[PDB]
Symmetry: D2
Subunit: 323 residues, 4 copies
């Protein structure tokens, strides 16, 4: 008979370290069939076999396949997570003359193919410079603005929460700490908003549990966390947490969870921003980005966010100026 | 050879609806071997068999057994969760003359047996009136004050969060809402402290997402939630959420998670309270209650908490006045 | 915008102990939105509230609601699990004159309503006498024969596996033991087919690990397991394992897992049976029952299975003879 | 107060692709604190930070740290998983003159340090040539023979099961297929023993579902699966399934699950083998390897297993001949 319930399908456009790790999460949790795509022949097929073997070991059943053409990787994809492209320099210069032309071109082409093969998909961009690339993707793919976002701020917020959790000796599940803005030295970790299960951090400072300076050192540590890992790895960059972040976003969409996750989202009025994507707290459900949350920022926070804004507007102009 | 790694063991003293449901969570998650104890012969053995069968179905392996003597139920228990005793009236009168003598007596006896067979266990009391019974248990068992707590506020907070989550259309994972105090009409849901992933509820009110009155209706709904279920059930009371709550507390202890969970804890100075247990936010880790969090309460909050306090002090006097 | 990914929806027609426990599994695993239906007003609403509270506690987000009309419980249901009806006598007489008329009538009515509101659903019947009721349901609902089955044999097989697992000291995950036939003293636990991770039990007997007599005692224990629990409970029957069993079946369908699970399935040729449902090993995927596995039974096994067959044919005649 | 329940601790001696992936499984499942050790400074620290960030993202709390000295990596380790050493050639020559001296030396040193710092640990060796290295480790560490094993056959069996599962269209959870012997072209996939939830494959052949030749092609595919991935990757080898395999073994030990998993185990009599480790089905529980299962092998199977044996004995002689 006919297939009444089909498995969800997630297409990883890019099968380097983050793409393969995201495929691993899918196989481990039986979240969805996975297609690993890449322009470089070889890696995708070896990773897809290894991943198919994982299903046996952990007793799950999803199909993991490698595909090298857009039509086969994209067709039927409920969600597409893009990591394709050159990797940026930790924390402008070479990026404007080498990163930007190359990545804006490839993201645009991926979007044109999403428009062609899976116009109803939920797109999650990872490729940098993030906020800039999410706009290029939105324009090329033509999908509703609530159906595309970029993964970055959940990763930066996860780092922020891990450091605070160590300082307070609590599980990070119970630390709510958020970073908004764009992924670079420009990001804004909101120290003032930190809560421990909804209890403001100010009281923990008054009680001598942690000091203001300590929180600012944590905020600075969060900003340079990406580069710190790049330097230790020697080659490549972080992938375990970036993969878990993108997959948590994809899962909230696929299961209409309505999780609240900071991510690069489309603004039309919030924070006074128009027609642009930038990192902000959003609700992700079965209708994609269902709400962009507007926080009451104080003077200093507005000043740092403004910096993130100027930075995204400048890169977008540079992208337009290439056409 | 010798057993180097043994499974954790959780003893459910009381095998009515909550005790059996907690045993189910253990079997489903392969959390620990389970012993179902009760004074009424029959139910514990039927539930233990049903539960042993669950392990096959869900592919886990823990031992679920019924025991009717203290020595066999308690010996080797890493955690003991007590639901034994009469059930209170939803939201003083009959409780002072019937509930209190009966339950203070049985809790005291259970504690004397914990002192005898598993003095190093982590005790979680569920039996009502909660805060009062936790003190009786602490005195009878003689365990360190950080190794005993009572489950109630996590359940009340879970109700509170579910209602707010529906009002805001977000996953309750991302609603931090807390109830402190004692389990009755005296409980204090902290509406002012509500946060959505650490973002204060006040802004959501300003943005027209929810109104103040609506939040107060939710707070009132939270207070009468237990009785509402009792009335719909016709017989007995809630058990799915109370079981999940107690087990989440036990899991944070067994795995030293350091989760932040409101629960009845020992105070010596916090909020100005001494030698008593009352519902407050606490950190639960491998050393039991590792921190009791002191919130900055405003005038109105102090007034309602005070009410919870007076109520717990009055019941404790009534318990002492029985010896 | 429009909802692109909606949550699966499972309708529990019957909200007694098994229906509510199945709703609990759904809330705990974030498997699907749940509707608890029943003719008795009260229980469904109290259980649905308790279950909604569980989602907060375990950090998941699914909607659990009570419904008392067919149109609201059934509409949009991807899977319908029916436990409605009188409960049989452990392990013919009163069943023919009281159980059969009452349950054949209610199952027929539920099917007519499934035909009306959710003709594309996957139906899992639990109501006894199982195999008989599954045929009544198939005829009333009119759904394709691969889209209806009955839960029983997975429960009986789970019991069988738990006992063998204890005898061998291995996890039941690694015991493959199956019961085929109809749910009663007529069931057929296939002792000869028992395997430990695919290794035949005969060698374990040769090695002195377990004896033939011991396996037959386990087979007999499996046959009377339902009644044993009924006697210990005093009131009602097993529900934790029966719920986990039905939900495992529903999950294999909803996620197109293609698990191999013994369950009451439609035969047209297998084992020489035609137009009837009986307990056999089947593959459950996104197209429902995708394969009914035909085992090579020996002389003695055919004889005991035949007994199950005669029993199902006799009850079906008795059901037809009521119209 | 004192820590009563401490988290389990798993030391990954080797932090290349498999070691870091195993650390990821630990963080994702909150299985245990993790220490990533390696001789190469840099990678371990970057991977440990990335992994610590994962805990925030997936809401778990375990500590992931990098360590470069034996005393700090090993002390307190409940389980030690070793991947340190040169990687072999897919499917003798250079291995005898370069791989063997180098790896036998490093494994011996790791064992001497395990004897010194964590003599009660459960050792899982991954480093090749596997069976040979497990004996070197057993001799150097001095731990009871039931407390050391090698991971290989579960990976080979997982590959075998995935291929059969695709051929039959069932979840690999329900395919029991085993490979015994040593990890190389010498491995023995037991085609005759294949079962689908305990139902022999011979009937599926009779029913035309799969053919004998097809099963032999799958057996051959299983033997060359490691090399196939190496060739597609271009650099390095498989790691997702090898990590999941080792961690499944470690989990069965840490939680005394008593899973049945083929792995390199100590023989003293089984299959007529003495004082050697070779890949066989074993039960892994809280007392380590609790049973080595002896299968009734036919003429052809004994012949192929013998080949695995001769191969392991030859490498062991070559290892002794180096001292």
């Amino acid at each position: 008979p006919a297939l009444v319930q089909r498995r969800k399908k997630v297409a990883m456009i890019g099968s380097g370290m983050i793409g393969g790790t995201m495929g691993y999460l899918c196989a481990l949790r039986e979240l969805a069939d996975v297609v690993l795509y890449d322009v470089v022949k070889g890696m995708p097929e070896g990773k897809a076999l290894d991943l198919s073997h994982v299903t046996s070991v952990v007793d799950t059943n999803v199909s993991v396949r490698a595909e090298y053409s857009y039509e086969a990787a994209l067709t039927g994809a409920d969600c597409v997570i893009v990591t394709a492209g050159l990797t940026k320099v930790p924390g402008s210069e070479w990026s404007r003359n080498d990163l930007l032309p190359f990545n804006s071109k490839i993201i645009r082409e991926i979007g044109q193919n999403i428009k062609k093969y899976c116009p109803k998909t939920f797109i999650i961009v990872v490729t940098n410079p993030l906020d800039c690339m999410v706009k290029v993707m939105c324009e090329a793919s033509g999908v509703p603005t609530n159906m595309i976002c970029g993964m970055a701020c959940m990763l930066d917020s996860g780092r922020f929460r891990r450091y605070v959790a160590d300082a307070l000796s609590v599980s990070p599940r119970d630390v709510q700490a958020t970073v908004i803005g764009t992924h670079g030295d420009c990001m804004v970790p909101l120290v003032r908003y930190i809560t421990v299960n909804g209890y403001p951090i100010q009281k923990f400072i008054k009680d001598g549990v942690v000091t203001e300076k300590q929180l600012e050192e944590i905020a600075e540590h969060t900003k340079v966390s990406g580069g710190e890992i790049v330097r230790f790895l020697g080659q490549g960059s972080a992938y375990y947490a970036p993969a878990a972040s993108a997959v948590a976003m994809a899962t909230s969409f696929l299961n209409d969870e309505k999780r609240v996750i900071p991510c690069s989202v489309y603004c039309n009025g919030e924070y006074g921003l128009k027609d642009m994507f930038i990192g902000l707290p959003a609700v992700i459900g079965g209708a994609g980005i269902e709400r962009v949350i507007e926080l009451e920022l104080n003077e200093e926070e507005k000043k740092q966010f403004q910096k993130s804004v100027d930075d995204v507007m400048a890169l977008n102009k540079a992208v337009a100026a290439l056409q």
